[PDB]
Design an enzyme around this catalytic site. Structure first.
Site, short mmCIF file in Angstrom:
data_model
loop_
_atom_site.label_atom_id
_atom_site.label_comp_id
_atom_site.label_asym_id
_atom_site.label_seq_id
_atom_site.Cartn_x
_atom_site.Cartn_y
_atom_site.Cartn_z
N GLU A 35 -3.09 -0.64 12.51
CA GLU A 35 -4.13 -1.08 11.59
C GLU A 35 -3.54 -1.40 10.23
O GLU A 35 -2.69 -0.67 9.71
CB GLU A 35 -5.22 -0.01 11.44
CG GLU A 35 -6.26 -0.34 10.37
CD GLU A 35 -7.51 0.50 10.49
OE1 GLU A 35 -7.48 1.53 11.20
OE2 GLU A 35 -8.53 0.14 9.87
N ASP A 100 2.13 12.20 -0.81
CA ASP A 100 1.78 11.50 -2.05
C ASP A 100 1.83 12.48 -3.21
O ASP A 100 1.17 13.52 -3.18
CB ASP A 100 0.39 10.85 -1.93
CG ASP A 100 -0.03 10.10 -3.19
OD1 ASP A 100 0.79 9.90 -4.11
OD2 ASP A 100 -1.21 9.69 -3.25
N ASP A 102 1.49 12.66 -7.51
CA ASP A 102 0.98 12.00 -8.71
C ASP A 102 1.41 12.77 -9.96
O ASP A 102 1.44 14.00 -9.97
CB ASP A 102 -0.55 11.89 -8.70
CG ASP A 102 -1.05 10.71 -7.87
OD1 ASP A 102 -0.41 9.64 -7.90
OD2 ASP A 102 -2.09 10.86 -7.21
#
Lengths: 391, 258
Positions: A35, A100, A102
């Site tokens: 996808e 991830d 940040d």
């Protein structure tokens, strides 16, 4: 919109990305059933795209011309054929294990910048987080086929593509995430929940982070020079109420002492308070609090939403950040955001040279090409070992 | 020095319950009554209903054990030599396969409840029975040299667990136990629940597990094999449809879970 069209037609490395996501020079289900999602300047967002080949991938991204596109799971059937399927018939099989980080998660202790702003002074948080994570991925989990990618403004993404990592279920991904998630509560008004004696992961991470605590936290960032911030973030991590009250009173009488000075005041006041036979135990507890503070301040901080599901969609490498204009390049621990290329600069360089290899983007393409070559070699070796084991 | 020198069904169930627990591995044979079929299924169903009720009430293993153990002597006996009890247990499990293979929700509920009952009964065993049962299932320990090389990391990993799970508050006692303890090496994905809680040591993609832990592997293998057998049971339900006298009973049994 025209700059993005030029970027996809002139600069984006579709061949290397295709080889990474397909795990093969020739097409396979790893690309046909993968996808992809596309985000557009109109505000539209389209899921369940998938591509038959590198030519199809490149042509469709060029034709659509999105601001960015995002990578999802490999499915049992092509996502582009979802109109032929019931929703329960389209199912995921694999996705790269992604983490991830940040910069905004370190604003409890960062001072030089706040929010989505960044600089090389604070990116040492991300560099150490990458170092600890890489140590975990290599020594604990045995991974080798992974790469870090700059988010374009404020974070870093690690894409793990080892076959055993790609095959993890959602439950397995959540437990892997829990294994590497140490600071599970971001609030500053408590000492950490970690049990003692340390698990070896925690002990090694602490020993890796200890040499950088003074230089980063106490000197570079220096967040505890503000007495109220020290009372709100540094003191609640300590084990004893009398110590906390003594430090609070001393700093309110003697304000604006730096983080290094306060860090020394903790030891001095504890030594003054805890005399007698219990002094060794109190020193040990104080040392435990300081060790937990090193982990609380410098250990990797992670977005759980990116890792906790196989089907999740994330901004692809070499995308353009819509606000900053930076390229979402691959990186390593020595990176800082000031080193990232920008779309306008790359357009200028291409107008001057008409060759991608002479732009500032080519070192990052070289890193990704080397990573893809290593990944493909390890994939082929794994297939050979599986065939020999089956034989 | 001086020296000297159907029945098959009964022997089968004696063999199957020598270990006191079973993975319910094999096809039953011979006959029982239809009244027995209904009653035995309902008895096991009552125990599993209470297990699921307690789990929905978020009660602990000790509380569930206190609640369920008095029910074995009435509904589904355990740690027993009786052929009738053994056949009752075995057949009731097999009946509820046919009741609960019918859908994914029913399969999940039955696997959860039956695996928890398996855990309860395994806790009731002596360590010798546990060892014999594990060995009968044909279920890699590390070398002493590897244990010595990893001794610091393994001890750091298990020292808290030895204190809290085995009550070894004295460090001297923990060291002696650790000197006597064995460790198992396997891929980290196989014990991921212990990984997420950082209860096992990880190295190069392998998890190092002490021998006093690891029952979750046994119960997970039981759950996985039961799920696969239920999927198989589902595939040959059209053969069950040849005796009409069983379908009302199975519909009644499944109605309490829907």
């Amino acid at each position: 919109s025209s700059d993005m069209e030029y970027y996809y037609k002139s600069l984006y490395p579709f061949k290397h990305i295709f080889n990474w996501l397909n795990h093969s020079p020739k097409p396979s289900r790893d690309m046909i059933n993968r996808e992809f999602a596309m985000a557009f300047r109109s505000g539209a967002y389209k899921r369940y795209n998938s591509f038959n080949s590198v030519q199809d991938f490149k042509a469709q991204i060029e034709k659509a011309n999105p601001d960015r596109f995002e990578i999802g799971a490999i499915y049992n059937k092509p996502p582009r054929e979802r109109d032929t399927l019931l929703k329960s018939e389209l199912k995921a099989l694999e996705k790269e294990l992604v983490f991830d980080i940040d910069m905004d998660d370190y604003d409890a202790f960062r001072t030089c910048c706040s929010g989505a702003q960044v600089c090389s002074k604070c990116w040492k948080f991300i560099s150490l987080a990458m170092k600890i994570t890489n140590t975990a991925l290599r020594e604990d989990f045995g991974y080798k086929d992974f790469i870090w990618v700059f988010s374009g403004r404020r974070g870093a993404h690690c894409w793990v593509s080892d076959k055993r990592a790609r095959a993890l279920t959602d439950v397995q991904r959540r437990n892997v995430l829990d294994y590497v998630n140490v600071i599970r509560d971001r609030n500053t008004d408590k000492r950490l929940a970690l049990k003692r004696p340390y698990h070896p992961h925690l002990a090694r991470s602490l020993e890796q982070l200890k040499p950088f605590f003074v230089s980063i936290m106490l000197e570079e960032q220096n967040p505890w020079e503000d007495d109220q911030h020290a009372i709100q973030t540094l003191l609640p991590a300590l084990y004893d109420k009398q110590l906390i009250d003594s430090l609070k009173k001393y700093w309110l009488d003697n304000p604006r002492r730096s983080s290094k000075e306060k860090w020394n005041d903790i030891d001095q006041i504890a030594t003054s308070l805890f005399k007698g036979p219990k002094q060794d135990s109190h020193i040990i507890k104080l040392r435990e609090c300081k060790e937990d503070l090193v982990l609380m301040t410098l250990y990797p901080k992670l977005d759980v939403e990116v890792t906790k599901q196989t089907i999740h969609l994330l901004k692809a490498p070499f995308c353009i950040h819509p606000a900053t204009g930076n390229v979402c390049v691959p990186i390593d621990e020595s990176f800082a955001p000031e080193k990232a290329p920008k779309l306008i600069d790359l357009q200028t360089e291409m107008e001057k040279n008409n060759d991608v290899s002479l732009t500032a983007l080519q070192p990052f393409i070289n890193q990704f090409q080397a990573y893809v070559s290593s990944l493909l070699k390890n994939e082929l070796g794994s297939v050979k070992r599986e065939r020999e084991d089956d034989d | 020095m001086f020296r000297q020198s159907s029945e098959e069904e009964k022997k089968l169930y004696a063999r199957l319950y020598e270990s006191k627990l079973s993975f319910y591995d094999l096809p039953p044979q011979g006959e029982i009554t239809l009244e027995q079929f209904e009653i035995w299924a309902i008895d096991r169903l009552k125990i599993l209903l209470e297990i699921e009720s307690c789990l929905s009430r978020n009660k602990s293993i000790k509380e569930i054990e206190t609640i369920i153990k008095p029910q074995f002597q009435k509904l589904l006996p355990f740690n027993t030599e009786s052929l009738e009890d053994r056949k009752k247990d075995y057949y009731s499990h097999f009946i509820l396969r046919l009741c609960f293979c019918r859908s994914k929700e029913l399969r999940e509920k039955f696997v959860r409840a039956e695996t928890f009952l398996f855990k309860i009964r395994f806790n009731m065993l002596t360590s010798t029975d546990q060892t014999k049962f594990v060995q009968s299932l044909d279920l890699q320990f590390i070398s002493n040299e590897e244990k010595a090389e990893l001794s610091h990391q393994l001890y750091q990993t298990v020292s808290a667990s030895l204190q809290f799970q085995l009550n070894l508050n004295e460090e001297h006692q923990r060291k002696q136990y650790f000197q006597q303890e064995k460790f198992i090496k396997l891929p980290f994905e196989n014990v991921i629940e212990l990984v997420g809680n950082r209860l096992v040591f990880l190295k190069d993609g392998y998890a190092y597990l002490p021998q006093f832990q690891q029952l979750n592997l046994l119960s997970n293998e039981f759950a996985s094999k039961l799920n696969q057998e239920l999927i198989k049971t589902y595939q040959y339900l059209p053969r069950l449809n040849e005796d009409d006298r069983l379908l009302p009973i199975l519909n009644h049994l499944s109605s309490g879970y829907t």
